[PDB]
């Protein structure tokens, strides 16, 4: 029964909710268990990076997030092809590969191609046989530099280009931003009915 002024509420408690209640008393225990597994995995895979293989830069979709980049699932086959890395070899040396991803633009492709090349320079490759090295990193390089890289490999950061202050030209001062948007919307809205009418008069005249 409502009483005086209040919000109309519809609590979703008409089923046997008490039978399905997930408590979180094992949350501290879960965090401990995940931590120990991370540490155990890192010791097992040393000196390979603890977080995992390197991931590519990808741009988040939709208008809400296209201004930001993040780590992708894996490098595309085109990116690996340009970088000169066989897709089968990439996984063994710590490069994630995503055959599903396609590069729509060349800016994204070059960003990840550069990321792969810069990763390859940073990579220290131990010989399969310690006594015999063929094309692996130098003994000196392996002996000292090799250490387990903690945290994401080459974290993906949103870079912002600084734009220095400048004198406003006459053209910029005369640019009508509001009217440009208003007409651009109408041009897109009426483009078809204009193509229909313009076409319709064409056979009318001819």
């Amino acid at each position: 029964a409502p009483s005086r002024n209040g919000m109309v509420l519809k609590p979703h408690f008409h089923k046997d909710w008490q039978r399905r209640v997930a408590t979180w008393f094992n949350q501290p225990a879960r965090k401990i268990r995940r931590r120990k597994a991370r540490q155990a995995k890192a010791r097992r895979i040393a000196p390979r990076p603890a977080s995992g293989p390197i991931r590519p830069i990808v741009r988040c979709p939709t208008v809400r997030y296209h201004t930001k980049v993040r780590a992708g699932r894996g490098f595309s086959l085109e990116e690996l092809r340009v970088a000169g890395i066989h897709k089968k070899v990439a996984r063994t040396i710590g490069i994630s590969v995503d055959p599903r991803r396609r590069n729509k633009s060349t800016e994204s492709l070059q960003a990840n191609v550069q990321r792969l090349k810069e990763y390859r320079s940073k990579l220290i490759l131990f010989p399969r046989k310690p006594s015999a090295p063929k094309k692996g990193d130098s003994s000196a390089e392996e002996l000292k530099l090799a250490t387990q890289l903690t945290g994401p490999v080459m974290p993906v950061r949103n870079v912002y280009k600084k734009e220095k202050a400048r004198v406003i030209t006459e053209e910029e001062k005369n640019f009508k931003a509001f009217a440009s948007l208003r007409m651009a919307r109408a041009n897109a809205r009426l483009f078809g009915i204009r193509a229909k009418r313009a076409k319709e008069a064409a056979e009318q005249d001819v």
Partner: protein
């Protein structure tokens, strides 16, 4: 804290604040929002005008990411840049104006509430209000559109 509740003060009063006549029964009046158009009509009409009925066009599979367009007014527009940038421009010898990219700050549209300090500025946004563009022009600035 149970020691601070009325329950402790109601021990020994018989009806526990619920009355001898009306009592505290299970659900006199129905459960939930029962009777909104009947015995509870007055409450619903008085505190919730508009509750019953259909209004407008329904849209299946609404993706709120598509309509994402956060706005920043003109009065708070200069907060998007460091105070060093604002003062250095005001005392700048040549008419060089700083470039403010509201998309970098996380805004897409510039609205025109308030007034601007009298100094040129290049504002970059996805969308501009009419008054917002007018006021930027009045102080000698420029509006630049981005995608």
């Amino acid at each position: 804290p149970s020691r601070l509740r009325k329950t402790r003060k109601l021990r020994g009063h018989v009806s526990h604040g619920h009355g001898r006549i009306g009592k505290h029964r299970k659900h006199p009046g129905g459960r939930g929002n029962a009777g909104g158009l009947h015995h509870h009509r007055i409450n619903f009409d008085k505190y919730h005008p508009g509750y019953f009925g259909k209004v407008g066009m329904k849209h299946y599979h609404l993706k709120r990411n598509q309509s994402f367009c956060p706005t920043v007014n003109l009065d708070k527009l200069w907060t998007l840049v460091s105070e060093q940038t604002r003062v250095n421009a005001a005392k700048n010898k040549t008419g060089a104006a700083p470039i403010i990219d509201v998309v970098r700050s996380g805004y897409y549209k510039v609205l025109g509430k308030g007034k601007l300090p009298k100094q040129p500025v290049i504002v970059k946004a996805k969308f501009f209000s009419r008054r917002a563009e007018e006021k930027i022009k009045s102080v000698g600035g420029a509006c630049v559109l981005v995608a």
